[PDB]
Design a protein around this nucleic acid. Structure first.
Ligand code: ZN
Ligand code: ZN
Ligand code: ZN
Ligand code: ZN
Ligand code: ZN
Ligand code: ZN
Lengths: 65, 65, 67, 64, 67, 67
DNA sequence: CGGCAAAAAACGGCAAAAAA
DNA sequence: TTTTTTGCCGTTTTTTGCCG
């Protein structure tokens, strides 16, 4: 979890808000949160890839929340 | 103990002090601290972005306290 | 949103169908191959030779034809 | 030793005696300053404005 | 599957048969050598010197000699 | 093996015998010195000035001569 | 307008691992 | 070792949207 992360990701997932995930290496990924558990986030754009949280630096929701 | 990270972040949150969050890759993220939990800091500039703590090196206030 | 409820079904789905995957590491290195098996911290990637890949060095796991 | 033992007294001795330190991060950035407080995960740096340093970014802590 | 059900039998298999291995770090450095021993966090890479490699710095462990 | 069977006896042996070691970090910088002491997360390394080295920044601990 | 069911998020018990 | 803490999972209770 939890507390501030999970409701944030859930709110972003429900409203299909486009997001810009920034990895620690600098690479930006775009798409929508399809699912997420404690360690990974299922990012969906034209393919549906699994992204490890430990590699993620920031999750930037493209439209105000 | 986790007892120096909380009172710090809450102090910053309460005083609405503009901070500079450095990432491990050298990126500087200026803005306000909306809320936080064990592993994420919510950071508020033109958009509320979620920042993973594990990607953060230093959190530098522009003010004291 | 529960611990490990998504990663395991995802990887198991990728392996059981032997779907070709591209595993991007945190350093940029792309590892093309097929998930042969996985556990809590590692993923055994099989292409030419079965190499063990640590998950903490993994950024993304991208399937090449949908799962 | 075994279990969170050497780290705490090292930082404590650095804090009590107000000893100036240079903190080398995993990227290469050198942060000189003074240790005001510390806990399991973070370290106050004092210097000009108390700045919070995450240990997971810290490579080493060298006394002066 | 789960836990270390895979990374332990793998490293063990690399250690009993004493196959030469190739340990890529997350920084790009390649470490050829041979698994002498390992525990939860470290791996003993024997060569001219036995060096202790931390798992959190390891990205891929490839069997050369493979098979 | 499991646990810290192998990482504690190694560092302890390197400390008892005051063996000079080269500690490589994940960024490539090569520290050198002598294990004064160590615990779960850090290693106290003593050379011209004693310093505290976080294990999470360490890739390998390479002795000069055997264990 | 009132139950019905999906889902979240808070509560609590369990048991491995840290601390003493 | 003993004792304690804490992250780990399973449950309940509340919400919310659909359906009756
Ligand atoms: Zn995290
Ligand atoms: Zn941290
Ligand atoms: Zn690991
Ligand atoms: Zn991970
Ligand atoms: Zn640490
Ligand atoms: Zn470690």
């Amino acid at each position: 979890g939890q507390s501030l992360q999970d409701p944030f990701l859930n709110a972003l997932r429900r409203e299909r808000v486009p997001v810009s995930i920034y990895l620690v290496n600098g690479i930006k990924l775009q798409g929508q949160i399809e699912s997420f558990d404690q360690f990974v986030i299922l990012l969906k754009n034209t393919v549906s890839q699994m992204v490890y949280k430990h590699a993620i630096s920031t999750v930037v929701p493209s439209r105000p929340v």
